[PDB]
Design an enzyme around this catalytic site. Structure first.
Site, PDB file in Angstrom:
ATOM      1  N   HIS A 166       0.881  -1.047  -0.154  1.00  0.00           N
ATOM      2  CA  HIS A 166      -0.072   0.008   0.186  1.00  0.00           C
ATOM      3  C   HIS A 166       0.889   1.393  -0.187  1.00  0.00           C
ATOM      4  CE1 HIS A 166      -0.149   0.377   4.575  1.00  0.00           C
ATOM      5  NE2 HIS A 166      -0.471   1.702   4.401  1.00  0.00           N
TER       6      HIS A 166
ATOM      7  N   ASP B  82      -0.435  -7.338   1.953  1.00  0.00           N
ATOM      8  CA  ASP B  82       0.278  -6.022   2.007  1.00  0.00           C
ATOM      9  C   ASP B  82       1.510  -6.067   2.186  1.00  0.00           C
ATOM     10  OD1 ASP B  82       0.630  -3.262   1.785  1.00  0.00           O
ATOM     11  OD2 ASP B  82      -0.409  -2.841   3.726  1.00  0.00           O
TER      12      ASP B  82
ATOM     13  N   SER C 260       3.377   2.760   8.595  1.00  0.00           N
ATOM     14  CA  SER C 260       3.101   1.675   7.588  1.00  0.00           C
ATOM     15  C   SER C 260       4.330   1.400   6.745  1.00  0.00           C
ATOM     16  CB  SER C 260       2.330   2.252   6.556  1.00  0.00           C
ATOM     17  OG  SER C 260       1.121   2.712   7.429  1.00  0.00           O
ATOM     18  N   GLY C 261       4.705   0.187   6.305  1.00  0.00           N
ATOM     19  CA  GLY C 261       5.453  -0.707   5.669  1.00  0.00           C
ATOM     20  C   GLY C 261       6.969  -0.908   6.729  1.00  0.00           C
TER      21      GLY C 261
HETATM   22  O1  LIG Z   1      -9.409   3.581   9.239  1.00  0.00           O
HETATM   23  C1  LIG Z   1      -8.414   3.465   8.317  1.00  0.00           C
HETATM   24  C2  LIG Z   1      -8.748   2.174   7.474  1.00  0.00           C
HETATM   25  C3  LIG Z   1      -9.420   2.010   6.232  1.00  0.00           C
HETATM   26  C4  LIG Z   1      -9.369   0.814   6.037  1.00  0.00           C
HETATM   27  C5  LIG Z   1      -9.024  -0.251   6.935  1.00  0.00           C
HETATM   28  C6  LIG Z   1      -9.002  -1.625   6.799  1.00  0.00           C
HETATM   29  C7  LIG Z   1      -9.573  -2.195   5.572  1.00  0.00           C
HETATM   30  C8  LIG Z   1      -9.680  -1.205   4.618  1.00  0.00           C
HETATM   31  N1  LIG Z   1      -9.789   0.077   4.759  1.00  0.00           N
HETATM   32  O2  LIG Z   1     -10.147   0.935   3.864  1.00  0.00           O
HETATM   33  S1  LIG Z   1      -8.428   0.833   8.423  1.00  0.00           S
HETATM   34  N2  LIG Z   1      -7.466   4.349   8.242  1.00  0.00           N
HETATM   35  C9  LIG Z   1      -7.390   5.167   9.182  1.00  0.00           C
HETATM   36  C10 LIG Z   1      -6.071   5.035   9.791  1.00  0.00           C
HETATM   37  N3  LIG Z   1      -4.963   5.066   8.781  1.00  0.00           N
HETATM   38  S2  LIG Z   1      -3.275   5.234   9.427  1.00  0.00           S
HETATM   39  O3  LIG Z   1      -3.403   6.282  10.415  1.00  0.00           O
HETATM   40  O4  LIG Z   1      -2.686   5.466   8.182  1.00  0.00           O
HETATM   41  C11 LIG Z   1      -2.849   4.266  10.271  1.00  0.00           C
HETATM   42  C12 LIG Z   1      -1.834   3.095   9.746  1.00  0.00           C
HETATM   43  C13 LIG Z   1      -1.716   2.121  11.022  1.00  0.00           C
HETATM   44  C14 LIG Z   1      -1.061   0.721  11.261  1.00  0.00           C
HETATM   45  C15 LIG Z   1      -1.212   0.234  12.381  1.00  0.00           C
HETATM   46 CL1  LIG Z   1      -0.366  -1.260  12.834  1.00  0.00          CL
HETATM   47  C16 LIG Z   1      -1.899   0.960  13.397  1.00  0.00           C
HETATM   48  C17 LIG Z   1      -2.641   2.118  13.250  1.00  0.00           C
HETATM   49  C18 LIG Z   1      -2.564   2.606  12.181  1.00  0.00           C
HETATM   50  N4  LIG Z   1      -3.056   3.828  11.313  1.00  0.00           N
HETATM   51  C19 LIG Z   1      -4.980   3.760   8.279  1.00  0.00           C
HETATM   52  C20 LIG Z   1      -6.390   4.019   7.301  1.00  0.00           C
END
Ligand SMILES: O=C(c1cc2c(ccc[n+]2[O-])s1)N1CCN(S(=O)(=O)c2cc3cc(Cl)ccc3[nH]2)CC1
Ligand SMILES: [Ca+2]
Ligand SMILES: [Ca+2]
Lengths: 54, 233
Positions: B42, B88, B185-186
């Protein structure tokens, strides 16, 4: 009851596999197995997995 | 990283930072060898051209240990799905080889079955990165680390609004305000065994960052070891 690899990792430093009913130890890349067949000796500086000390 | 502590000198040397055209960090990576960096698929859509910086702990000053490397090959997993973040994972082959030195050194790849029965059943692993210091916040200028407990597959599925596939595992805290977050991430999730750190996961996603009742979701590296071995050739 815990035996072989299940008992404190078979005394191995790193990987432990049960071949027959005994422990076989091995090491990540960049390590060699010591003569005792259990410890893993880094073959260079900067072996994987170690925080850097200089 | 929300919470946690700074990586001190020499403590997180397997960390790599993917930087965009504007020389700004957008994602982490783990150093696998002098030529290969492990990252999330991603991250590959969060910028057009990118390079990799290693050896950095403070992106606001050059402590003369940093190096940038150009990417030669990108091997993205062919089943990556953007909708669910499943598969991912990606490997980068560098143009020029990394020089290992203080703060720059690879994390070990484990053997699959041993990692599953021995590494992933430890209490905790370590996740590190330069991403946001809270959901709404700005990216950290210092490299940070956070110890995160492994979480039960069952609890995690109960907690999540998105599907947790067998290619993912959860780590983190229910209520405690500590988590990875955007920009991390990553990056690596590693598990210490005796005195050696092994790579166990890749920072993938969460619903926000550090929300109560939510956890962090990491790509389960052990499902991909054969694939990684292949990619490195
Ligand atoms: O809520 C979502 C999601 C969208 C999704 C998810 C799962 C499946 C599909 N979609 O579209 S979570 N967001 C908001 C948070 N962000 S982020 O702040 O980049 C992020 C990456 C990350 C990684 C870990 Cl291990 C924990 C918290 C995180 N927040 C990540 C993206
Ligand atoms: Ca710096
Ligand atoms: Ca939480």
């Amino acid at each position: 009851t815990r035996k072989l690899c299940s008992l404190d990792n078979g005394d191995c430093d790193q990987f432990c596999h049960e071949e027959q009913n005994s422990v076989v130890c091995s090491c990540a890349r960049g390590y060699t197995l010591a003569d005792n067949g259990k410890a893993c000796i880094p073959t260079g500086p900067y072996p994987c997995g170690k925080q850097t000390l200089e | 990283i929300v919470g946690g502590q700074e990586c001190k000198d020499g403590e997180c040397p397997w960390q790599a930072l993917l930087i965009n055209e504007e020389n700004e960090g957008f994602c982490g990576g783990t150093i696998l060898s002098e030529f290969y960096i492990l990252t999330a698929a991603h991250c590959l859509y969060q910028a057009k051209r990118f390079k990799v910086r290693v050896g950095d702990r403070n992106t606001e000053q050059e402590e003369g240990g940093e190096a940038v490397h150009e990417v030669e090959v990108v091997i993205k997993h062919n089943r990556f799905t953007k909708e669910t973040y499943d598969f991912d994972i990606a490997v980068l082959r560098l143009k020029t080889p990394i020089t290992f030195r203080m703060n720059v050194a690879p994390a070990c790849l484990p053997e699959r079955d041993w990692a599953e029965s021995t590494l992933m059943t430890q209490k905790t692993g370590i996740v590190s990165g330069f991403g946001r210091t809270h959901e709404k916040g700005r990216q950290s200028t210092r490299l940070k680390m956070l110890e995160v407990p492994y979480v039960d597959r069952n609890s995690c599925k109960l907690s999540s609004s998105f599907i947790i596939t067998q290619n993912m595992f959860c780590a983190g805290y229910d209520t405690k305000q500590e988590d990875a977050c955007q920009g991390d991430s990553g990056g690596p999730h590693v598990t210490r065994f005796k005195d050696t750190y092994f790579v166990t996961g890749i920072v993938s996603w969460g619903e926000g960052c550090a929300r109560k009742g939510k956890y962090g979701i990491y790509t389960k590296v052990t499902a991909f070891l054969k694939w990684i071995d292949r990619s490195m050739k």
